[PDB]
Symmetry: C3
Subunit: 313 residues, 3 copies
């Protein structure tokens, strides 16, 4: 098919600023070239210009609600467009609060989408359950229909419309979930594979079940929101909220290779890469290199190798 790259240098969904450099370091890693180097048709819609909102005091506990609501709103429009151009949207973040706009925009063109959320967190806190007030830990609550009604009128998000059901999403990699978040998981019956299930079943069965769970009834567009902190910090240290005991480099590549093979990948998010938090220059390149590898895998790069339909001998 074809790809649609869109940079989202946004950080207001959380405290640390370095995350807005994500699009920059990833593009610098030669992402667009590496992709073209494969059988990929790439179109870059550029880095979105996120208007500065000086007047943005908290809503109760929630911080920078207008800036986050605006950035997600803009992204949504940008994603819907690339999708209306028949391309796989690739959002380079940026903090995870942007998923509100990415999945929202994506669902405008494909309302029957299925979401796979690779993360160490569920990011399903509501404005009233959150304790940090950071919006990169609440995106999923704004997207679920079952939750519509537990979400107050938060400045900046009146454009939002819950576009996914509790049963159109699967979490993979969870190892740090808050109490209120766990309650929602169990109460709404969300399908998830915490690190415990990954250890018990193995990443092969997990993927088998995940794809089976979302594509059993029928085939439909797949959206992959990949938070780099889903992988163990020994692979991706340059990120804001790292948690030990995460998915390995291999497991990260396995997940994406399996998604590509479905041929249903429709939208992709690579979030939470923060070059400023790398304890060393090598820690930064280690994070960017791994993030790039996962992305290339999403678009065909296989560990067993690739070859064009021709006779090489």
């Amino acid at each position: 098919r074809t790809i649609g790259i869109i940079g989202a240098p946004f950080s207001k969904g959380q405290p640390r600023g370095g995350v807005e450099e994500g699009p920059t370091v990833l593009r610098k890693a030669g992402l667009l070239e590496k992709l073209k180097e494969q059988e990929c048709d790439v179109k870059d819609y550029g880095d979105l210009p996120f208007a500065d909102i000086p007047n943005d005091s908290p809503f109760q506990i929630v911080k920078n609600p207008r800036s986050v609501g605006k950035a997600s709103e803009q992204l949504a429009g940008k994603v819907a467009e690339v999708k209306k151009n028949g391309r796989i949207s690739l959002v380079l973040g940026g903090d995870h609060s942007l998923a509100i706009g990415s999945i929202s925009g994506h669902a405008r063109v494909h309302p029957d989408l299925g979401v796979i959320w690779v993360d160490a967190h569920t990011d399903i806190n509501t404005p009233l359950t959150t304790t940090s007030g950071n919006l990169h830990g609440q995106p999923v609550s704004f997207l679920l229909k079952e939750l519509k009604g537990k979400i107050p009128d938060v400045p900046g998000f009146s454009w939002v419309t819950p576009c996914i059901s509790a049963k159109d999403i699967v979490y993979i990699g969870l190892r740090d979930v808050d109490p209120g978040e766990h309650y929602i998981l169990k109460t709404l019956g969300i399908k998830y594979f915490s690190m415990t299930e990954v250890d018990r079943l193995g990443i092969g069965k997990v993927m088998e079940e995940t794809l089976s769970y979302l594509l059993g009834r029928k085939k439909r567009p797949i959206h992959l929101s990949f938070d780099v902190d889903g992988l163990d910090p020994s692979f991706t240290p340059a990120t804001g909220t790292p948690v030990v005991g995460g998915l390995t480099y291999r497991e990260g590549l396995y997940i994406t290779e399996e998604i590509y093979k479905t041929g249903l990948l429709s939208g992709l998010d690579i979030m939470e890469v923060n070059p400023s938090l790398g304890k060393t220059p090598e820690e930064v390149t280690r994070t960017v290199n791994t993030a790039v590898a996962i992305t290339l895998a999403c678009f065909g790069l296989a560990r067993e190798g690739n070859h064009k339909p021709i006779d090489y001998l």
Copy 2:
């Protein structure tokens, strides 16, 4: 249920001294608070006062037999008491020679106990098979009934009484077993899962089989003796006898999460943590943090999250 914490700052079961600091660094890591932070009822019986035995020459090859026999004897009494108070005994070590007293004391109140021994070693050498003479590598030989008769009259252990059968114990994590020790394993028919079986089956099946092996016939109290060197040294370097190729942080957490879910955990040992052997200050905190994580997992902390029986929305 409820917990009973007891510190065992003892090192004479082996050469390096730093191990007696175990209770200190673990408590400093905020273990008692973290536990209370969960649905845990914690009672600390304090650090046991281990009397100094100046006159303790070797028995043949065996070193500090009187000091080890005395410390294990005292611990046994302390454990039996906390158990008679209806609490899960948590012994903070200290070298592994203390397991003689811990399992002994535990079996006084619950003679039908089952033991799961996570270690890189089997610690089943006899005074006559040991080559090091260090008692932290012989505890299991003093506890088995099948071996009663191959154990000489060692100064300090005339109070001991073999309280477990060869079929009431399962080893997990073995990767450094002496020749004589292997002979005993095969001769007595002890159930074990070396690193080879873990690689072959996966930690999920291993736990399935372990719990099935010990709880098949009927449900009974479970005693977990956790040696931190069972985990690969990249996770727990601050320990006396580290061996490469050990259990991962994840596998360590998987084992303990599964044990908790049985609801049969009765006694727990966290041994061989030596702050003095950490090549760096980070190596020490890395070891203590991991040791604390395994402990919290033993008492309920789940990677998928936890929540109280209440409506969070």
Copy 3:
């Protein structure tokens, strides 16, 4: 049985020179002693004297063809001899181009041999498909019968005779395969387990299938060509072409333990160990120690322990 050690200090199959020190650092690690320490009958045929070929300009793109062809030719003779002495040949390399001579020499005495190739690469490029021109990435092409006819008359290799069929070899560990190489894999129907299959099935099933694939029809001599870069570089960094996401120390030991248990190990190669490329002195010892461990495992050393047929009690 018995072992036949032969050092192959050769590097001309690739650019970096340090690799010729392989036999030296491995022997220095006390390999011969550690082996004898087991129930092993060891005979060292010494390090082969590789004649200097000053006049060796490229053949098209292929570099040092005469030196490589000569060294492999000599090795072949040396291996056939040790095999005619009823011993398991152990070739200490040296770059992987030597496998041409090792498998060739081995097949002279045992034409029905089966090959297990642990590597991050397939080393199956032909003189015409290679892009590097380095011969350590083409050995397999000179050995297959299905390919005989796609290989030009390369100076130094007129002594070669394809001795194995596409179905007498299994790859394990692949994660960096060129386009032309992938074409050959799929076209000839070669059985391989890339890192993707290892993640999907687990190393236990992979070995089950590998041994089943090569020994299903009937039992036959097994040749194991072990490239140290098959293992992740966190275990073997001192090597020329390291690739992230490789086999773990444990998986490396699992493969070799399973091969030993077959009792069919006939020939073994330990290649690509380059002491000069270790970023630190510890990186060098880490690589040599792991390489030695894999070797000892090939000859009986088990993680669950070993014991002689005698009563230890």
